[PDB]
DNA sequence: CTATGAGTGGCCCC
DNA sequence: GGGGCCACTCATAG
RNA sequence: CUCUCCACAGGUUUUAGAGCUAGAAAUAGCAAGUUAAAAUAAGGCUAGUCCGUUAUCAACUUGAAAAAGUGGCACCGAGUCGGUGCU
């Protein structure tokens, strides 16, 4: 008989539960054949289990690393270009100079030339370092001196500028006009006034440059600037913005009434993510305010760095850094004198001990500036004459280096100016500098446009550039080889996000005019008004909505309910008293783009004319797509006949960011067949119905739902490769879905290839997508009428049903005991789903469920994965006399140069061969696990025998090489199991099966004061907990027995037992909350540390893999029902 | 008598 | 989080 | 929610920046310290101002791979599954 059955599933991010049940909710048990060379021919297993795997990773880290690699390659290429230019003239001076520069890294033994790179003789090196203690002294010398200079020094300065050319955020020629502190402060005030028109700040008469750039501490400058603004507080939003500009860490919680703390700091690398999180909670209308704050911060940092402005010169940065060097020298001398005079004992700890956070650790060690200031602050306060030193420490200017993290704000125009000054002064003596000045300036300033991408000949999957010819792309002929227009067109066709509602179309910009109209009309659709004499609230009519928009939304950036009441209902419709529902204080929608374009173009008729909609949409799209001003001008050049020069100039400067959620074809592209109206047309006026956006797409009376269903293409989703990205979700859930489909395939295989009646899936639109994926792969029958035959029905259930089922019928869930709960959730999902389907014998069902939940044999499978990723840790360690350091190059011996350490093992291979041991070089047969690291994987797979022979293994048996990826399972005596974490470490592999009564007791005792139910039920549960306190002893006894049997952690187990007796009088709730922590000792996976009351139990690591070389290797399928057991003790025998 | 492997504790991770 | 590595002490064993 | 591009500032590593005096040496005292070069996943051939950390992967047979194929059923029970019966 064909047993009708269903497959229940519980898809997660790290686990994929699965279970097979019959019509009676019983999980069948079948006897499975076991292959391999062991005596166990057959094993009986229950058809229930769970699959565990590592979480999926997103491509963010790989993308960052790839971008970094490209940056490094292109910087190397710039230096190569400069050396190519200088190559001809350098040979006449010192031909080996470029070789000596390249070989500076090597030790004296590996150097082919003289060890001094610049001049090659020690006298000239000493003279150079005495005359130019830093590179900035040389830079100032070249900028200022008219005398003929040495060509090597010119190359050094030019290469130092080109290699560290600074940021590109400031756009266009010039710089001092954009760098005004006053200008950006005025812009910030204007932005704040625009966002907070009700509370304008009068910034007139405020000398922002004098206050913000003065030599005071950050808090003092903040307070001084606030004091000049009447009515303002240092705790206000503007005060917090100024503090953020000055480099402090203000809290925005009070200014936005947020639940959690909102602290931002521009110096932190995570500023972008925190700002995105803050904007997602406060709204994206404040992005311009934070951009203005960042710009003001950059201006402040530049004014702090380029202190020297009075003296007439053309290299301000060089003079500023020389000034910092002089200040550091003076303060160091003063500090040495004072410390020697007053604290002779601490002189060594400050100036000699590199392990401390003193000056010695600040310079020769790894101490940063913050740690150095922390270490030096208390010492100065204990000494006399340190007033000025304390002031500088409060200013963060004491003993300050030149190459610090502050230099991230210096524009590339300053470096370009210094480069131009050098090239102008020194070209009189060296003709090739004069002939190549433009080339060097281009090499410094040329930046590959972000819309051209990698410059590949097709052999890169990331490239979209189109080539006019086949010449090599250099900074000087980029424009002649690359077609910038075609590249931009390809970049638009590739980048733009596809709409989710209509997959083929492209979403509109978030600031698009049509999008703003759509939002305004959607919000106005559900507005109700109540006037005197009206029995029920009424919706706004189409003419009413149009009048409201024209009178308020086209005149005010933000419109509130009170404004509507006093401006439209009263002034226009003569309603003295009106009540409005659906909007509390203000409308979220706003015609911000409309107001900006009215400010720029200054033609309201042009904006309100529907004939001009396409032009405005294209202008907004062009502004949102691109950032380079050349493209912005080029694309807008088609509209030059419609606007004057000033309007076009103002349009060129306006920029937009972000994309919306809906496409133009969805809103105003598709039309209802019966009426011809779009979604926007119905939003403007729908008569008495007044349907909103969601209603329009779901109303069966309109063709919108049919068109959405037709345009959207039901695809394979996951389980078809290169088509998974078509689905929408995190990569981890995609991995879970793929594993789920594989599990379903193997389960159908096991049960005699009869497809299940039902497939209950549990994890919303992603669940539905999974549903049609499994439906498509399940049903393969087409009738003559083309209707699908529903042999398999996929049902999706909410987790709340299962939660109520657990809490109501005492099938309590405790996560910490073991990983059995995944399979149990899957089984309960299946039971509930089948019950509801049968709707559309309580005692027997309850007994069956309780019996199934108490089964100790559950097929937990840990998915074996061949590790990939970084070769080793990214820290470069100092040289050591150790053989575990990895060379960074082929010819860089780690004993001399240091290098990477801690490589990651891809997989281990069992090696049966003979190795020479001892000084006698005697051949001895050995059998061990050898770890094949990720770096060596390709070489191993290319020729395993040669790779093993290179490691000293001789007489290698090729047939006995066994591939053992991570989490390979070995079975040892008394059922003890260990999973291979790496070639030199193991993991726990056994699962504790507590009886259900202990699980219920622990669940009730842990939530003793947190039960959610009727008071009588809570009293009953408390009484039950108090009655069965002796279960604590039984739980401890079972933990001890299981540990002694399979864990073998005698020391830690004794510690736990001793601590248990110590706190036996503790409250029962605390005892349960602490015992639940004890199961970290027995949980599957890597050992972990845990706290039992006040006692911390350190983790027990299994650092020996010799014990598994004589155990039973188990190859488990994805479900674990099919397995092949290999007894390694029979391999390698004599 | 000294060279070799075996476990335990602690530090470390752009 | 969890695997790698080093220093110290212990067992081994020619 | 996901994917992609262009740049910046650091940081680490080795070398260069002549250490002096008293002392046979161990060592003690003193002087100095702020910068630069090179590398930043080993490398690869398709030789590009390209690619190299995402995704996928139990065992056996066919293959280069994609990919395909390989493992009887019913009942009574449960400490990681056991027993009984038919084929």
From Swiss-Prot:
Residue segments, region RuvC-II: 718-763
Cofactor: Mg(2+)
Disulfide topology: none
Cofactor binding note: Endonuclease activity on target dsDNA requires Mg(2+). The RuvC-like nuclease domain should have 2 divalent cations, while the HNH domain should have 1. Crystals are often soaked in MgCl(2) or MnCl(2+).
Entry's EC annotation: 3.1.-.-
Start and end residues of each stretch annotated as PAM-interacting domain (PI): 865-1134
GO biological process, one term: maintenance of CRISPR repeat elements
Residues reported in the UniProt entry to bind Mn(2+) 1: 10, 762
Known outcome of mutating residue 822 to A: Only cleaves 1 DNA strand, probably the noncomplementary strand
Keyword Cytoplasm part of the UniProt annotation: no
Binding site for Mn(2+) 3: 1063, 1094
Catalytic machinery residues: 10 (for ruvc-like nuclease domain)
Short motif (PAM substrate-binding): ranges: 1099-1101
Outcome of mutating residue 74 to A: Significantly decreased DNA cleavage
Notes concerning its domains: Has 2 endonuclease domains. The discontinuous RuvC-like domain (approximately residues 1-62, 718-765 and 925-1102) recognizes and cleaves the target DNA noncomplementary to crRNA while the HNH nuclease domain (residues 810-872) cleaves the target DNA complementary to crRNA.
Protein function: CRISPR (clustered regularly interspaced short palindromic repeat) is an adaptive immune system that provides protection against mobile genetic elements (viruses, transposable elements and conjugative plasmids). CRISPR clusters contain spacers, sequences complementary to antecedent mobile elements, and target invading nucleic acids. CRISPR clusters are transcribed and processed into CRISPR RNA (crRNA). In type II CRISPR systems correct processing of pre-crRNA requires a trans-encoded small RNA (tracrRNA), endogenous ribonuclease 3 (rnc) and this protein.
Subunit-level organization: Monomer. Binds crRNA and tracrRNA.
The protein's name in its UniProt record: CRISPR-associated endonuclease Cas9/Csn1
Species assigned in the record: Streptococcus pyogenes serotype M1
Chain's gene name: cas9
